Design a protein that fits this description.
part of a larger assembly, 7 chains, A mainly alpha (121), B little secondary structure (45), D mainly alpha (51), E mainly beta (45), G mainly alpha (67), A: mainly alpha, 5 helices, G: 67 residues, mainly alpha, binds zinc ion, transcription, chromatin
Chain lengths: 121, 45, 45, 51, 45, 20, 67
Amino acid sequence: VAFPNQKEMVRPLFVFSDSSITHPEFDLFLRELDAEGLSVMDLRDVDYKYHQLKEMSSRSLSNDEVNSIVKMKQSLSSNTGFNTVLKKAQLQEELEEARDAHDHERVARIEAELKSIGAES
Amino acid sequence: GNKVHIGKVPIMLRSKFCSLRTLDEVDLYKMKECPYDMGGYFVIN
Amino acid sequence: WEEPRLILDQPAQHDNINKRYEIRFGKIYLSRPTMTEADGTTHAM
Amino acid sequence: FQSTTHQKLAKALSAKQKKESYARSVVTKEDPEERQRRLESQENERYRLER
Amino acid sequence: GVKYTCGACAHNFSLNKSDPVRCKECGHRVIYKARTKRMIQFDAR
Amino acid sequence: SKPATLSDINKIIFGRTAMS
Amino acid sequence: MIIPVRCFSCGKVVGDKWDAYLRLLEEGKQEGDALDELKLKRYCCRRMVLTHVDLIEKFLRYNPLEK
Ligand SMILES: [Zn+2]
Ligand SMILES: [Zn+2]
């Protein structure tokens, strides 16, 4: 984002407040736009944004989109008990595959990884 | 000439090829499985 | 491995060429149970 | 019994039948029927081309 | 319009009779309806 | 081409909960 | 499941003595002596505390369904 008077800034989402914009805030924004020499968004563009938000909020996600969002949050997932159990089970399956294939090098790494992940309370 | 899928065989619970064989007491609780359950059966449909 | 060899023969004459076609069965591979969804993805069951 | 030959024979025959594991484990990463359906699609395509 | 709850991560969301039955965040395939809002009374006997 | 009023901006309020 | 509030036979309040009973058993008292200390004289009331199985501790180990 960017203030008109100030410069560009990268901000996270939680900084924004759910409270509505007050009259002096919008007036100060208009004064900053006039100082920089900019204009306000057109009413046609305002309606286009409103329709875009309503369509996006009322949209129905597809299976592929839902799986992509789930994979994205799984990449963001630091830890979750169900997911840790599933990962440990998958690692155990990979370990038995490596043991049955007589691969003495992979199995040590999988055992070390399981030891690091494990030791619950 | 490689691996051809010839079918699916139902797995007896708590056996060597079941997923619950390894799980300890805590992950068994996280998986909504009763620790008093003994296995020895199949789940068809 | 009880009946490990299927055999098909064809004494083609159409220069006599006796052709035998045979397939052998090898190793059995098993996995942990898996679930396949309608959208195509798979995960441990 | 205390003869070394008998003890070695007993040990060898006891541990010989202990080792028994034929099936080898593997990890499935996709749906097994994928090969079947993709080859049916390829066969149908080449049937249409041949026709 | 109707509230649900995920069977794995206990997350609350809503459905509009057109989305796939899935959890938004962890993608579990099992969800539960939320408790009603009508008054619930018992006779303590 | 008309300027946007306060109510027009209020129609497109997108809260932090809505962002999440 | 959880300790009954009243004795089934006579209705004496026994639901306030479970933690004290566990404390007394922790200190090393015998079960009969612990029941005597809690002033449970009739064997109908002694049966209620002596034969109770606390199943709620097993039910609480499953993760909550709503948060
Ligand atoms: Zn979930
Ligand atoms: Zn009593």
